[PDB]
């Protein structure tokens, strides 16, 4: 149960706006975006409120004013990763302005890999909707696709992470599809990194939520790139080693 | 996905403690408890962190220092309602001190019915675990039971509400059981109030989550009190009228 979730989102956005006008990205600014990231975890109605309360404007403003604040970018892109999981909200992200930001951030080195990873996750859910959903002229879909492949291959698979998942369902939904091989690749990489580095936390979660048959299905899939099948097999092996 | 949820809980508890030492229950104090209520919605790990960070001490302190602050009590008991849904955490609530607080609050008139309702929900999940779980001498289980029946029957079924549900699953789990008839009664009342006053929001949620067969099962149940079956039938009728 809950109270007024709308007042919570608005209070955070008002705090962010005040810190923007103060031109100050301190622990309070970072906390407010972290709070939004946290409260949008598997909570689509909070994602919708962030957009409906002009949150994207504050996102863009903060990117412009604080281009070197790495933790800020991590928190903002974590929030947008949650927004991007809600299919009904993804059309709001399909603007040349927003897509260029997400594509540019694929090359971010901020907070290790977290900004690049979170931007790749946003784009993975966007590309899952197919070329019909891509109504943007700049950049072109296939350019962003290549930037996504290059981003994923650039990340250390043994990276320690500043992100937590309570469920893999949004990531698992990217596996049984041939619409967007790059989205399936990002999802498979996400699972592989997390079971490799944090098996005690994430192997039982992946097993309980049915990840194993989905990954074996990838290995038998024609539209799946060879690199995706290789990673899927390694996730199965890691999870099997954990079960033993 | 999410970031550091632990820092969020701790920051709220630190804000609450500072307002306690200032002896000030203002909008900031109320917001901090509302934030905890909101972030514990269907989120057991946040409930566990609240308890592990000495949250119950702050709860008791605030009840003592601010006995007439109605919105504060609503928010605090909403948070505890979320904690009480987590079976692994309910043993922490089984102390004479805590049970007496929840039982006393059944007669609260604060914020309409919200404090009484939230305290009754806490006790409904506690009593769902059976008499074996009741290790408290004062008060006795059957006294609290009677206070719960009297509370539920005192509430206007047409009450407007200051609570939101994103799922009825914790309430529905109280229906198919004969361990605690009063818990089943509270759960049935909760559904009846919400489909009566907010059918556009809650009839589709109850229907989608399988509430109808559960309520019909109650009508066929021997351990179910007649008043519970009457309410269950009315919920079915309201939901059927809505479907038509």
Curated annotation (Swiss-Prot), chains A, B:
Transmembrane segments: none
Tissues and organs where the protein is expressed, per its UniProt entry: Expressed in testis, spermatocytes and spermatids (at protein level). Expressed in spermatocytes, spermatids, prostate, skeletal muscle, ovary, small intestine, heart, brain and pancreas.
ARM repeat ranges, renumbered to this chain: 5-41, 43-85, 87-128, 199-241
Assembly, per entry: Interacts with the ELOC-ELOB/Elongin BC complex. Part of an E3 ubiquitin ligase complex including ZER1, CUL2 and Elongin BC.
Similarity remark: Belongs to the zyg-11 family.
Function: Serves as substrate adapter subunit in the E3 ubiquitin ligase complex ZYG11B-CUL2-Elongin BC. Acts to target substrates bearing N-terminal degrons for proteasomal degradation with the first four residues of substrates being the key recognition elements. Involved in the clearance of proteolytic fragments generated by caspase cleavage during apoptosis since N-terminal glycine degrons are strongly enriched at caspase cleavage sites. Also important in the quality control of protein N-myristoylation in which N-terminal glycine degrons are conditionally exposed after a failure of N-myristoylation.
Protein name according to UniProt: Protein zer-1 homolog
Native source species: Homo sapiens
């Amino acid at each position: 149960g809950a109270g007024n979730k709308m007042g919570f989102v608005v209070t955070m956005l008002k705090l962010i706006q005040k810190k923007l006008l103060d031109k100050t990205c301190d622990q309070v600014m970072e906390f407010s975006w972290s709070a939004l990231w946290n409260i949008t975890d598997e909570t689509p109605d909070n994602c919708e409120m962030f957009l409906n309360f002009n949150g994207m404007k504050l996102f863009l403003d903060c990117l412009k004013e604080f281009p070197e604040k790495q933790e800020l970018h991590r928190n903002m892109l974590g929030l947008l990763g949650n927004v991007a999981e809600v299919k009904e909200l993804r059309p709001q992200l399909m603007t040349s302005q927003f897509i260029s930001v997400f594509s540019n951030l694929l090359e971010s080195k901020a907070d290790g890999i977290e900004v690049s990873y979170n931007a790749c996750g946003v784009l993975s859910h966007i590309m899952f909707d197919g070329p019909e959903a891509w109504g943007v002229c700049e950049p072109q879909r296939e350019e962003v696709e290549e930037r996504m492949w290059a981003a994923i291959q650039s990340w250390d698979i043994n990276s320690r992470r500043n992100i937590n998942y309570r469920s893999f369902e949004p990531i698992l939904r990217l596996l049984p599809q041939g619409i967007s091989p790059v989205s399936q690749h990002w999802a498979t990489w996400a699972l592989y990194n997390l079971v490799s580095v944090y098996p005690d936390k994430y192997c039982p979660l992946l097993i309980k939520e049915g990840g194993m048959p989905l990954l074996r299905d990838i290995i038998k899939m024609a539209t799946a790139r060879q690199e995706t099948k290789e990673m899927a097999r390694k996730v199965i092996e890691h999870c099997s080693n954990f079960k033993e």
